[PDB]
């Protein structure tokens, strides 16, 4: 059905090992939402890609989005760490 429990957002930019994710939870802010030291899980078909948050706020927004819309910051920057095998 809808986005189940433990849902944050969708990937919207890949630079190899620097993922940028757009938040979907409007005003949850409370397991707390992704902090700086928190981990996130990205499942790809069968395996889960684990990553660590690195930047939250205006630091994760792409350069051109800031020039276009500098008042909305709902982005986080994830750096991939490792993957879970079989």
């Amino acid at each position: 059905m809808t986005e189940a429990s433990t849902y944050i957002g969708t990937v919207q930019d890949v630079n190899g090992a620097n993922i940028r994710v757009v938040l979907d939870i409007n005003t949850i802010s409370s397991y707390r939402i992704g902090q700086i030291g928190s981990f996130v899980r990205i499942p790809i078909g069968y395996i889960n890609l684990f990553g660590i948050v690195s930047q939250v706020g205006a630091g994760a927004v792409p350069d051109k989005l800031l020039e276009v819309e500098p008042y909305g910051h709902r982005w986080i920057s994830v750096q991939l760490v490792g993957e879970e095998g079989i």
Binding site: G57, A58, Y71, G72
Partner: protein, 522 residues
Amino acid sequence: VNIDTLVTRHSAVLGSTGSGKSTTVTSILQRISDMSQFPSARIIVFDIHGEYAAAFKGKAKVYKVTPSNNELKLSIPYWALTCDEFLSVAFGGLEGSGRNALIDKIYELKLQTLKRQEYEGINEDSLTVDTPIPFSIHKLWFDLYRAEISTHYVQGSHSEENEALLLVQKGDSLKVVPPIYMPHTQAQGATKIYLSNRGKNIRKPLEGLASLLKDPRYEFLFNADDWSVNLDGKTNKDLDALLETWVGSEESISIFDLSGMPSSILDTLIGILIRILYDSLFWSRNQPEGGRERPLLVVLEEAHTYLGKDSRGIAIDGVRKIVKEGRKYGIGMMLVSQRPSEIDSTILSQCGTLFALRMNNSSDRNHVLGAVSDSFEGLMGMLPTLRTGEAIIIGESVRLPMRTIISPPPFGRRPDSLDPDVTAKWSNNRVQGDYKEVLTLWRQKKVRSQRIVENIKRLPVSNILSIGYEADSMTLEIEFNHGLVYQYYDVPETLHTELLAAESHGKFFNSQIKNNYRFSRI
């Protein structure tokens, strides 16, 4: 308008310079802190231009820099600061081994003070540099400056007992005068004198600190009245008296007038005050004197000069900490500015309530629109055409975003800074001046002349509120409104005797005495 959400969820007042936001803030503060309805109010105002003291004549304590008639004197003891803020204030942020040397000296002086004076719950084990324990700064300056210039009488050993002083200048610790030492010369014929071998590279910072100590502009820092430190490390009063005078007086509103303070340290001092208040109201959150049992509100003026996007000051950290954590410990906030585009978006977005006055340009309107959470297209298009004194209240403290007219304050309570008037001074006829007197005052660095009469007894009565005179000195003293007191010198008895018997109190003063006799404002 809800008041619990107005304090716990913070607020903000934004408008143009012509919108009269000062009157709105004054009316709001007077309404919230009413004696009849809220006998236990608690408000702190960080006035910058000193334009709120006039509005509250006898309803609020005022802590200015230079008291004249009834205002107190603002004084922040230097030993209440932490190590980093003290370094940033005095030395400007040294980064070499001099920082380590100064930290070690602070630790040694604090240990000696603890040994001399007993303190509760503090011992040699639980003492930190952060601990607010009084200690002498003049002694530290004397020691560090003598350990860098004075030359030992005997070479090889540079102990203090080998002082090679030419005799004359013993030097004083309380005073800034340094001692004199004989020059270093190890040549044959005369005695061999060697300079100190432990001198660090802190000659210039110590000279700067000596200049700061000798500067009268830092009396509130280094010469606290009841919190001055002797050489043995003892003060007349303690920090509890300061805290009680700040947030425990019988008056609901306390105003800090920071107009006369230096412009290069205002941010640091605001950060210092914010940190002290937050710590004091945080560590005692169970006692009835804490914030939880008596919430406190902080009003900050001209927030755009310190809460910029890339501001590197200390006040921004304190403001962020209050905005993020005051909802639990009961510490509110209320930002007032006339340039919303300069305030950090991440800070402006967390303000619960917005009092949007008339804004002229488009950047401020766009920023306000972007930093709002409840918008009606009908009302928000009315922003550039709002009447003076009218506000649009928006946020969590109201059921609906409504357009209100703030109730005007009672008569005689209109805020107005005592800015000197261009027309009056510029239109007056030019008179002779005393170049020698002003040169002497500039050399002395004092604002009080020598011909000032001490204790003239005045009598009750452009307006004149009191009149005093003396026959021995023949100097007239006329007291105007707003606390102004003047002293005209060398006046015959006939003039003031006729003035006292005149029809009114004035007019004739401006006719004959206003611009003929040399005066001196006190």
